[model samples]
Target: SVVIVGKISFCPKDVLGHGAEGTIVYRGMFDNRDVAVKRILPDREVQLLRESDEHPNVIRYFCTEKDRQFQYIAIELCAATLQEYVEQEPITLLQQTTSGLAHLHSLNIVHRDLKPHNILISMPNAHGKIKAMISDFGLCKKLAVRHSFSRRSGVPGTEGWIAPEMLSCKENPTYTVDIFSAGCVFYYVISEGSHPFGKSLQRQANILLGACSLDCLHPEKHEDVIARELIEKMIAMDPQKRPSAKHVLKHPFFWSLEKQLQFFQDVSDRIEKESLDGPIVKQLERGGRAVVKMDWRENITVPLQTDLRKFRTYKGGSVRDLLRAMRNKKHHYRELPAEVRETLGSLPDDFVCYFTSRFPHLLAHTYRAMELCSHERLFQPYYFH
Candidate 1:
């Protein structure tokens, strides 16, 4: 039988998803556009959806109608949930999810029930790019001026995805709870559906004890290193330490290769100018095995070295020397040997990888070194914008 609610209609047989509490979403039509008509017993979700302003990364709301048995909400129809969108690139999806979550937090709304199932993968836009949008606002809360809510009503999120503070109820839960859940979602996306907290049965217990593994994200790949850094902080047991949604968006994980190259250049220039005995320089001079254990110049091909008239290898063990050498080579790329030029391929692409791969620890090491000097005017740009 066809069920009708105002101008929207759907066959109950064509279901999209079923909620734990009897809510059901069905593929339906509204104003000639396909929509997910969410049918649920009367509750506050409709009011919440109606109150939310539309955002590009959020599910689009159409209309809501009610009969004696159920309230129906017509929202944007999506292609799949994040859980089912296995083959898609995760970086874009994770960014869009963060953007949507950031929007909600900006509006003083905390999506308490964030999880993979509640995140929808939209149909591709004109640009042929799919978006990940946050949905299912049943447990969403509008905050007062303080921007946090008490757990007096009970912890509202699903198992495993819930933040540690929510389980302890030791303090008022804030928007960081969503950050924690998003961290898990990020790991799941990057690791091809593996939870950072281990198996499903042990996840919640693992989350509670702050025991999680990001081992799935191998250390060798630069993308994995960046992702691990962000996820580790996002899932911090101390909610106060977690980065804000805006901060997450600004993270290096989302930085363009151009921006990353620029960052490297800037850091190299700044560190090159630092006093020889300065703390940053000193720490960098005592560089760990991962970065400075071997002669960096030896990694450069002989033909390239000969072209530069640099037959003798660089003997400095400090990371500072390595970074300075990179900056010098990049500055003189147009004049480098043809073989070297061909090996590096192009600016900011193969060139960046050449250095980063040779010294797997360079990016993280330099990023931390710069962090130590973040208060300085020269280093502030790398940390801030």
Candidate 2:
């Protein structure tokens, strides 16, 4: 009622993007704020919003607005996605990923779609890393869903990050699957956007399986041995066998706070720096200034073996170190002035959605947040959803 004040121009006539289950686009909106009106059934939207809100990094739902044929969530918009950031504005530092991962870890929320596309900027800054937020739920599974035990659904995520175990089962997905995906995303973001298994998600996984798989970035080729270690632990074929997000968060591989912070800040800014004027084709054809294309691994190949034994050594991302820094400094942390934080001294540690009534402080600055969020994630190249 409130969000739908008038009309909009960005609404998509048809979905510009389609996935395994549905389609997505720049949906119609009411105000200056863009809304990704998800055209999902009541049950799918309800279930997804329910599970997604429990985590802090996940997308924030404004409200479920429905029409005759569809129901949509009026969520706050986020800037470019992780995938876009990797290609356009690659970070040479480590802090960008660390700050984001630290926040997610504190909440025990494992982003199922941890790829570059799902990870995004909630706010931006000139420093480097922006406040990143994880969104999209079609592929997510909450490890701590309120009182409910972690549900092991059979929906394995994209092929590239789905652990070997999930690949074998094909139907039964679990928390471990997310861990592997997160690790892969972390590896790519940290290494200037390398596709661990080249091409689409399917190609990446196929290459890792030892057969005539896609030519992909070897997870073992990262800066530290810990990347290889996390890859092995995450990509395990057995959900019961794979390491938990908690464990990966605690690993020593993530022990470089300064490095993580630097990377986070650097990459966050790099992607947003690109220019986007003219028509869509004209802007995109620039090859993003002859820089990274955001979708860098196009029709290419990079292959590697999924040998678990070869993943012995371990080096985690800078995110772990970022958390320790938060625990130690505790000073830079600011209350976002939302009921979510105002009612509580600090921001809630997990995923959630808040409104003016829910978070009065944020309500006033909601406009500010929306305006500022774009500068952080300039690469995801998303206007709304």
Candidate 3:
């Protein structure tokens, strides 16, 4: 039993996309209009419509049909999803969904699942990019769903952007939770397009690893502090302090439309070029050695001039003077081949973890290595440029 729209006519065409619910396809028209027919599992269609009902920014739900024993939902075909458009130009899109968010705020609705996958674009112009719209409603819930201090879903919404207050099922959601999500969405779209909450990518021993880089976990010297701080605020661990969505609109970071526009123009290149870096712990300059607890393997002392504690008498310096100072310092991964990008990416993680985990046994090895460097004996036997 197949559900028919007015008539059980069949037309074969290309697919738009496949999702957890079902496949969306191009079906023959009932009128002179093009429509996307979503054929889905029985209960899923009702869930989609029931959640999407009366939402203006979302697709219009015209009707549902249940023939003898089958069912389907007829919806207005969308121009394209943001995911599709960005694929064409390699760009990130920031959805200024003020109206929809406002409406949700009014209804006290909180879209618990606000990730890139759930957001779709209305239409693109000649340039092939447009603002985002809140698309999926299946995971949405009102702020009053449950406890006043619980996480909505153990993994509800996106991982990183989830407001701290919503972490416990006892914690209830408010419009502020959306504010934090919006901030995360805005930062990723406008900045380097990295995942807002995950560790950076690393490759070790031919295996790829993802570790949170210093940059991802926190805003460092990078220029994204203003935007990232907004995300931090919205995602604050304390729920009572989260700002409302209405107030977030007044955030100073978003005050200038031009600033954000410039960010969009450069976003693609920035995302593609962004590199993950390890932590720079401490820089210690001692009398003879400037020990650095760098983003390196086991912390070890590097040999430098023991006279550093006193004033140094130097001859007029050449460029080689600086190179001479770095003479005994061991540089990691300086010999990595340029071809294996994935390998280079993982070197930092491997270098740090290899020694840290092996510290119990290798601590003595590290001690000997530091002593060897102190005596200028370690690299004496190894090749150096």
- Full candidate order by TM-score, most accurate first: 1, 2, 3
Off by over 4 Å in 2: 1-10, 13-22, 27-32, 44-47, 50-56, 89-113, 125-129, 141-155, 169-173, 199-223, 237-241, 257-385
What clash count does candidate 2 reach?
40
CA lDDT, every model vs. true structure: 0.81, 0.43, 0.43
- Each candidate structure's TM-score, on Cα atoms with residue i matched to residue i, is 0.91, 0.49, 0.49
Report the lDDT tens digits of candidate 1 across residue range 330-382. Answer: 89888877788877648878888777776766787777667776777766555
Candidate 1 residue-wise lDDT at 33? 88
* Per-residue lDDT of model 3, residues 167-230, tens digit only: 4434465666666566555545554455444432321111111122225533332124445544
Q: What TM-score should be assigned to candidate 1?
A: 0.91
Residue 30, candidate 2: C-alpha displacement in angstroms: 5.1
The runs of at least 3 residues in candidate 3 whose Cα sits more than 4 Å from the true structure, single-residue gaps closed, are 1-4, 7-13, 21-30, 42-56, 68-70, 84-95, 124-130, 142-170, 199-225, 257-385
Instruction: Please report how far candidate 3 places residue 7 from its true position, in Å.
Output: 6.5
lDDT of 2 by residue, 98-213 (tens): 34444444444444555666666654435654555656666544455441223355544565655555435334454455566765666676566665555564555564572221
RMSD of 1: 2.6
